[PDB]
Structure formats: structure tokens, C-alpha cells
Amino acid sequence: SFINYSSREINCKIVYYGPGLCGKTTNLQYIYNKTAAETKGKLISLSTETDRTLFFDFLPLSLGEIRGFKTRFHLYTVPGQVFYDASRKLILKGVDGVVFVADSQIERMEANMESLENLRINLAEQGYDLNKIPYVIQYNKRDLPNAVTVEEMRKALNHRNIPEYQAVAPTGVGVFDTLKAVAKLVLTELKKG
Numbered sequence: 630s631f632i633n634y635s636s637r638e639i640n641c642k643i644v645y646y647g648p649g650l651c652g653k654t655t656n657l658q659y660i661y662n663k664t665a666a667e668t669k670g671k672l673i674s675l676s677t678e679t680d681r682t683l684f685f686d687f688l689p690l691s692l693g694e695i696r697g698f699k700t701r702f703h704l705y706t707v708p709g710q711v712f713y714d715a716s717r718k719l720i721l722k723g724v725d726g727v728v729f730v731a732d733s734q735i736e737r738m739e740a741n742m743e744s745l746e747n748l749r750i751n752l753a754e755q756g757y758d759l760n761k762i763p764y765v766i767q768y769n770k771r772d773l774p775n776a777v778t779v780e781e782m783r784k785a786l787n788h789r790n791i792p793e794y795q796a797v798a799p800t801g802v803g804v805f806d807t808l809k810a811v812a813k814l815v816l817t818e819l820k821k822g
């Protein structure tokens with residue numbers, strides 16, 4: 630987080646992580662579409678001249694408040710396909726909370742596990758610890774006939790029983806619940822230290 634004690638402004642960063650095509654961008658699109666105009670900024674895509682179609686997303690929002698400050702949450706996604714580790718590492722810098730978006734399709738379980746381990750490693754490689762940071766897991770794509778059962782998703786991907794939400798990101802199932810859960814965890818940490 631960045632706290633400016635003179636201007637009384639706090640900026641928090643939430644990163645949506647997970648394997649290729651798992652639903653990260655779709656989460657932010659639904660959040661943008663369904664949030665009141667007065668509490669959201671603009672959802673934008675970003676890429677660079679070096680790889681102009683390697684897109685990730687940025688969306689600023691007003692969620693909860695810390696008394697005596699203006700607090701804004703900046704939501705980011707990452708490029709989840711395996712090759713793009715360097716991009717994921719750039720985006721994770723300064724993260725305050727993480728949402729791991731798992732693709733419930735059975736064919737994508739290995740990719741879910743690879744991406745979750747990559748999250749843990751990348752957090753360690755910038756001095757963070759996944760076990761301590763505000764962190765919520767989303768089991769997305771619950772609508773698909775090849776989705777793994779929720780119990781099996783939990784046993785495979787949520788060994789520490791952190792908060793978990795079923796989702797269908799394009800229709801909004803679970804999307805705001807996931808966001809509000811991680812944002813509350815981040816705010817609680819701000820109020821602590």
C-alpha cells in the first residue's frame with residue numbers, strides 16, 4: 630500500500646492471478662459494468678510496444694473506508710499463460726491482496742496448480758509470503774459440465790481453508806463476494822499496522 634499522511638490518501642493494490650484464460654479479465658469487466666458510476670474509475674487494458682497484444686487490466690474503485698483517509702483500491706490482472714512470468718512479476722510488486730481465479734474445468738487442473746505454485750514463488754521472490762497476505766480463492770466456470778466438484782477444488786487448491794467462492798464470472802455469480810472478501814481483509818490489515 631501507499632499511504633500519504635499529508636494528503637490523507639491510501640492506495641491499495643489487488644492482483645487477480647491464475648492460469649491462462651481462467652476468467653481474471655472477465656471478473657474485472659463484470660465489476661466495472663455493475664459498479665455504480667460514483668465509486669469506480671475506468672477499466673483499462675495495458676500492454677507495451679514490445680508486445681502490444683500482451684494485455685492486462687487496471688480498474689480503480691472505492692470500497693471500504695479507513696477513517697480520516699481517502700482509500701482507493703487498484704485492481705490488476707496478469708497474463709496467466711505460462712510463458713509470461715516476467716509480466717506477472719512486474720504486476721505483483723506492491724500487492725496488498727490477491728484473488729486466485731481457478732478454472733474449474735477438469736482439463737485445467739494442472740494449469741491451476743502450476744499457476745498457484747507460481748504465485749507462491751513469485752511472492753517469495755519479492756519478499757512476500759502467500760500464507761500471510763490477504764488472499765481469497767475463486768472457483769470460476771461453475772457453469773461448465775466438465776467442472777470439477779467444489780469439494781475436489783477445495784481439496785486440490787485450498788489446503789489452508791482460506792476464503793473461497795464459487796463463480797461464473799460472465800454472469801456475475803460470486804464476483805462481488807470475492808472482491809468484497811479480499812478488500813475487507815486488506816482494510817483490516819491497514820487498520821492494524
Ligand SMILES: Nc1nc2c(ncn2[C@@H]2O[C@H](COP(=O)(O)OP(=O)(O)OP(O)(O)=S)[C@@H](O)[C@H]2O)c(=O)[nH]1
Binds near residue numbers: 649651769799
Ligand atoms: N463458461 C464460462 N466461460 C468463462 C467464465 N469465465 C470466463 N470465461 C471465458 O473464458 C475466456 C477467457 O476469460 P478471460 O477473463 O479473458 O481470461 P483471463 O484469465 O483474463 O486470461 P489471460 O488474460 O490470463 S490469457 C473468455 O472467453 C471468457 O468469456 C465462466 O465462468 N464460464
Ligand SMILES: [Mg+2]
Binds near residue numbers: 654655684685707708
Ligand atoms: Mg486477461
